[PDB]
Design a protein around this ligand. Structure first.
Ligand SMILES: [Zn+2]
Ligand SMILES: [Zn+2]
Ligand SMILES: [Zn+2]
Ligand SMILES: [Zn+2]
Lengths: 66, 391, 260, 183, 46, 111, 89, 66
RNA sequence: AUGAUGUCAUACUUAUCCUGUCCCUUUUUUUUCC
């Protein structure tokens, strides 16, 4: 369980849980060709630049911790 | 546990588990209570670790198997339970201890703790030990530790194999004998758990070994033969062609020694060397088989257990190469021999042989001797066992 | 194999002799026994022999009763259970408790062996599970929960989820206890219910429990939420609710709000 | 403060006694009110271990679904001396149930709860789903009125009840079919 | 193996059994209890 | 589609000896390929490159002729970013390029 | 005392002895054998060739997973060769 | 099976000697005063034949008589 | 109106158990003579 990333426990903080679901959402975006293409349509960029901005947002999201 | 603390318990236990009159069961039960209390107590046991191991290390060397797997388990729980530095700093003074007993069982201890906390964590300790310039006994111990790590960890040695070799290599040339012997033995254990991979990691080790193969008398020689033996399957059929053809000579000459350690080694050797795809049948048929069935097939061997099994295997493989009718044809006449255990041996041998190669190779007359042999042997059964029947 | 050569009378005698072979201390004996009992169940037909199973005194624990239960299962397979169920479900009525939990087990193994065919009988078993899962004594909740599990794996994908949700209601309070067998039972239960119902409903029961002040509730709901989390982690994305952003952190994922 | 914390939520009612002790109330306030999620069961802070046998001793043993009742197995199942049992082995009689395989190929095909917004807890059985405006049949019989229950004629004069202030009962401020005369 | 400590359950059941069956039938009373014999039941009574 | 489960990025050796498969994070696996006695393709047992808390931008096969194969893994570590409440590690953190070396003889994958 | 080794799953086929022959490993059940067992040669090697995944006897057959563990996808975790918490031999 | 006869015989004996003891919707025996559950009625009866069960009836006796 | 402490007692659970199993404990002052 521990070595499986995303494992929660009783002491789990807000920040960690939400940054988890963030990163997992981003791996889903990298995963599904379409939804990615939807993103590229809406905000106009390349598929590439989209995935790049996401890979930048992987570590950050929500910004600094508390 | 958390209430009373480890101190009072062990103070009131270790005398009992140390008792001269101790049972089998009572022992095992006190082992159980030591486990169950050591699933809880973690930081607490630090002062008692040695005070535990002293009683427990005798469990590792024992005639009972279940006692051994228990012992390895509880030392695993202790080392992992305590800290690395706790174990290390604990167990040093037993390395140079006068008695070799504690040195040995201590080596198996380091094997267990190294399985617990992993090889790389404990490496610098060892690599420091085998280079100790004080006295040889230490290096002997540490090398034995390398071995027992090889046996215990086994297949999982693979990643650190290189570093381990780089440690052990310096003992092969040492002035003391033991260190050389146990060293090359440890190489053997490695390669046997190294089944084929990492050949070049053993690389720098070879050239001395082969040289030693020339000049040695006694047990150390046989040990080298053990190592080289497990090595050869890991070489290339071209290099191992030459090197093998060199080993075959000494292998031949050395069949005749009364040493049973010898006969074990050279036996398993003959398996690996002559079970090589790059070896020619006729050469074995001429040079080997007649001395092989002469010296090796005798009533000294079969009465023993390990020699029995290993003999079975080696003979099976020789059949796997030279073919069926040869081996069987030579050993059929022994089905009618007086003793049981011997008959049992040739019987299970015929069994495995005809299991693998198939009966198609067998001619007619030898088949008459077969069926008659099998009936005859089957008609006299002192004990109940499958070997004759499955056979 | 042959089974015709022998008249039925001999067979039923074989039955009444087979019944006490279940005292065997060996597992393979019981194995062959139950499988045979299925074979002769084919040679005769269900009703009589399943009645002879329901005769059982239950007298000792395991070592065994539940082997007779297995016979009830395999017997229910050998000819359609589509016949057999009403007798059993009626035999839950009996006030003797250990045979009540017995027939609960019979349903468990029953669905385990039938698999897909439970797309119908789910309804029949549903109210009885209601009565059983509503607790007389812990073993009821446990065994009934196991039934919910195997049912839940078996029916998957065929569109019966509704009644499984209803049963999930009554399953849900049992989450809390320290008894190992009932807690691991409930775990298996909610796992099968996870795959059958789909994660969304699960998570909608598991949200509030995560952050609740008490330690207990958090321990458990986080255990559950982990069980839901490891599998189907890919499909969870949509169902995380909207959580407002605080000072130092932005907790809104705006990607989903991009509109063409 | 548990006071002011109740100003930050759309449905502050969700905040409770021990809620103010939460490690992160500033969230749990926002979760517990999530749209379709369901409340945590209430059996904790009650130390009773989730059940007792008070109300559970008055329950029926079980009752079959009507689809299984029409079948007729119920009457077939229902006693024996020991020597009759060893005679039942030596004699043995076959075909006591003698079910109709047509019938048990019929019922569950030819013939043959709650929504998500509900969850069970310990003592709850009947009550929530006898209320002002909702009564049982028989007590209608004792009352003897043919298809308002007549003291909701006096709920005209004396006024709406203090006990259930939210009340509506038919014909007065509540503009009724079958039994249920008020909601 | 049968021998052991006397239990309130065994002892009360012994009261009831002795009341129902009578003093002179011990084998019948030992039949109901487990892990106890007739001699032990009689001597336990008297 | 997972965070830690491979299949995301895919690379292979020019000589086709060993194919390397990778996820976005934490798991990079290798399957070694050798034709059978009949020259029909047989696949080996997997290996493990596991490196904790490491994001993989892209993986590309590397050319070494009849050598111990190399692989180019773009990586980054967020473990610096999670433990830095200030937000400095958000900046001042450069993605690490690492070449893994498969080794046939030692039959593992070492950084 | 007895728990999985959970080393990475290889291509080696599982081997069960006489005793364990029919059992699906994790669910402990005999029902619906469907898919096949894989364990690493680190767990299966040498004296473990054709060894039982459990007791340590010679394997007479190959373990098949149930359909239950299939849909719950447990068969994809680390190699389910039980190790006693001493050595494996 | 002989074991089955004992269960039957020890229920009837605890029925004879028997107003508080009952059987719940399950099979267990219960004392309705003390709210105790009994494995066997005779085992339950002894608790029913005990001095604590005695008291709690008297206490409820007084508690009603007031 | 079920808290805690007690080696009273009985039910019950887990298709757990009851047949598998001996194989690297071989540890010593090097020492087998055309
Ligand atoms: Zn492994
Ligand atoms: Zn086995
Ligand atoms: Zn399974
Ligand atoms: Zn009472």
């Amino acid at each position: 369980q521990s070595k499986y990333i995303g494992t929660g426990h009783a002491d789990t903080t807000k920040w960690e849980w939400l940054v988890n679901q963030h990163r997992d959402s981003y791996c889903s975006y990298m995963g599904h060709f379409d939804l990615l293409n939807y993103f590229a349509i809406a905000e106009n960029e390349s598929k590439a630049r989209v995935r790049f901005n996401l890979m930048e947002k992987m570590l950050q999201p929500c910004g600094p911790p508390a | 546990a958390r209430e009373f603390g480890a101190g009072p318990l062990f103070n009131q236990i270790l005398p009992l588990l140390m008792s001269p009159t101790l049972e089998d069961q009572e022992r095992h039960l006190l082992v159980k209570v030591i486990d169950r209390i050591l699933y809880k107590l973690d930081d607490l046991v630090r002062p008692y670790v040695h005070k535990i191991l002293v009683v427990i290390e005798p469990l590792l060397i024992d005639e009972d198997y279940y006692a051994r797997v228990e012992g390895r388990e509880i030392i695993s729980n202790l080392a992992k339970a305590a800290g690395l530095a706790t174990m290390i700093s604990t167990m040093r003074p037993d390395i140079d201890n006068m008695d070799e007993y504690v040195r040995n069982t201590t080596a198996r201890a380091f094997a267990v703790v190294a399985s617990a906390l992993g090889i790389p964590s404990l490496l610098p300790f060892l690599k420091a030990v085998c280079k100790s310039k004080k006295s040889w006994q230490a290096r002997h111990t540490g090398i034995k530790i390398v071995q027992q790590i090889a046996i215990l960890m086994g297949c999982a040695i693979l990643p650190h194999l290189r570093s381990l070799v780089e440690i052990i290599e310096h003992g092969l040339v040492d002035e003391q004998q033991k260190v050389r012997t146990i060293s090359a033995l440890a190489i053997a254990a490695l390669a046997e758990a190294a089944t084929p991979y990492g050949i070049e990691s053993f690389d720098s080790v070879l050239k001395p070994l082969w040289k030693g193969i020339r000049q040695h008398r006694g047990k150390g020689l046989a040990a080298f033969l053990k190592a080289i033996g497990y090595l050869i399957p890991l070489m290339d059929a071209e290099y191992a062609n030459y090197y093998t053809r060199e080993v075959m000579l000494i292998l031949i000459r050395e069949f005749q020694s009364p040493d049973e350690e010898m006969k074990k080694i050279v036996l398993k050797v003959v398996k690996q060397c002559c079970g090589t795809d790059g070896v020619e049948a006729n050469y074995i048929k001429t040079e080997i088989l007649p001395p092989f069935f002469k010296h090796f097939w005798q009533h000294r061997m079969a009465l023993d257990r390990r020699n029995y099994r290993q003999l079975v295997d080696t003979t099976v493989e020789l059949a796997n190469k030279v073919g069926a009718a040869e081996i069987i044809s030579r050993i059929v006449d022994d089905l009618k021999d007086e003793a049981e255990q011997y008959r049992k041996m040739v019987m299970e041998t015929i069994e495995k042989i005809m299991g693998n190669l198939g009966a198609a190779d067998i001619d007619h007359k030898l088949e008459e001797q077969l069926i008659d042999g099998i009936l005859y042997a089957f008609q006299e059964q002192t004990t109940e066992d499958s070997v004759m029947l499955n056979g | 194999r042959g089974a015709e050569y022998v008249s039925a009378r001999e067979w039923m005698r074989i039955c009444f002799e087979l019944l006490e072979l279940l005292k065997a201390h060996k597992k393979a004996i019981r194995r062959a026994t139950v499988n045979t009992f299925g074979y002769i169940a084919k040679a005769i037909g269900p009703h009589d022999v399943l009645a002879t199973l329901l005769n059982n005194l239950k007298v000792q624990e395991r070592q065994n009763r539940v082997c007779t239960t297995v016979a009830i299962a395999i017997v229910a397979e050998t000819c359609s259970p589509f016949t057999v169920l009403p007798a059993l479900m009626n035999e839950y009525r009996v006030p003797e408790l250990n045979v009540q939990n017995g027939v609960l087990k019979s349903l468990s193994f029953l669905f385990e062996y039938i698999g897909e065919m439970g797309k119908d009988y789910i309804y029949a078993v549903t109210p009885l599970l209601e009565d059983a899962l509503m607790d007389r004594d812990l073993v009821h909740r446990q065994t009934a929960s196991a039934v919910v599990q195997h049912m839940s794996l078996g029916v998957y994908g065929f569109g019966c989820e509704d009644s499984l949700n209803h049963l999930l209601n009554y399953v849900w309070p049992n989450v809390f206890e320290t008894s190992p067998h009932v807690i691991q039972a409930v775990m298996g239960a909610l796992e099968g219910l996870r795959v059958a119902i789909g994660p969304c409903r699960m998570l909608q029961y598991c949200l509030q429990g995560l952050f609740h002040p008490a330690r207990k509730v958090r321990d458990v709901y986080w255990k559950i939420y982990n069980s839901i989390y490891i599998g189907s982690q890919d499909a969870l994305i949509a169902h995380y609710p909207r959580i407002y952003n605080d000072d130092k952190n932005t907790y809104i994922r705006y990607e989903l709000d991009y509109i063409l | 403060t548990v006071a002011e914390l109740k100003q930050l939520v759309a449905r502050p009612d969700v905040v409770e006694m021990h809620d103010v002790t939460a490690q992160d109330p500033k969230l749990l306030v926002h979760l517990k009110a999530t749209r379709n999620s369901v409340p945590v069961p209430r059996h904790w802070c009650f130390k009773r271990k989730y059940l007792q046998g008070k109300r559970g001793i008055e329950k029926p043993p079980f009752e079959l679904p009507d689809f299984i009742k029409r079948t007729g197995i119920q009457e077939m199942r229902e006693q024996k001396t020991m020597k009759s049992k060893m005679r039942e082995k030596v004699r043995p009689k076959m075909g006591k149930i003698d079910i109709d395989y047509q019938k048990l190929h019929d019922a569950f095909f030819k013939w043959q709860l709650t929504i998500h917004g509900d969850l069970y807890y310990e003592g709850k059985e009947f009550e929530t789903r006898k209320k002002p405006g909702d009564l049982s049949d028989e007590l209608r019989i004792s009352l003897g009125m043919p298809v308002p229950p007549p003291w909701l004629i006096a709920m005209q004069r004396y006024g709406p009840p203090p006990s259930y202030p939210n009340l509506k009962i038919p014909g007065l401020n509540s503009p009724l079919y079958g039994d249920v005369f008020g909601t | 193996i049968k021998g052991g400590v006397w239990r309130n359950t065994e002892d009360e059941i012994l009261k009831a059994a002795v009341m129902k069956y009578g003093k002179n039938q011990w084998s019948r009373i030992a039949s109901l209890l487990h892990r106890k014999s007739a001699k032990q039941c009689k001597a336990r009574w008297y | 589609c997972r965070r830690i489960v491979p299949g995301q990025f895919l690379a292979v050796d020019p000589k086709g000896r060993a194919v390397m498969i990778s996820a976005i994070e934490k798991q990079k696996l290798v399957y070694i390929l050798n034709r059978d006695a009949a020259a029909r393709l047989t696949i080996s047992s997997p290996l493990e490159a596991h490196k904790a808390n490491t994001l993989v931008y892209h993986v590309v096969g590397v050319d070494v002729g009849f050598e111990n194969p190399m692989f180019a893994c773009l990586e980054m570590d967020y473990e610096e970013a999670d433990n830095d409440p200030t937000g400095e590690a958000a900046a001042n953190t450069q993605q690490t390029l690492t070449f893994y070396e498969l080794d046939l003889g030692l039959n593992h994958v070492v950084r | 005392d007895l728990i999985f080794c959970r080393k990475q799953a290889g291509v080696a086929i599982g081997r069960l002895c006489e005793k364990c022959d029919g059992k699906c490993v994790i669910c402990d059940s005999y029902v619906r054998p469907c898919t096949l067992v894989r364990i690493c040669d680190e767990c299966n090697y040498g004296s473990y060739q054709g060894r039982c995944v459990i007791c340590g006897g010679p394997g007479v057959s190959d373990a098949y997973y149930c359909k239950e563990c299939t849909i719950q996808e447990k068969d994809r975790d680390g190699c389910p060769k039980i190790v006693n918490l001493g050595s494996s031999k | 099976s002989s074991s089955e006869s004992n269960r039957d015989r020890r229920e009837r004996l605890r029925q004879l000697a028997l107003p508080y003891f009952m059987k719940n919707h399950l099979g267990s025996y219960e004392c309705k005063l003390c709210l105790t559950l009994h494995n066997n009625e005779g085992s339950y009866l002894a608790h029913t034949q005990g001095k604590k069960h005695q008291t709690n009836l008297a206490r409820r006796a007084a508690k009603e008589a007031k």
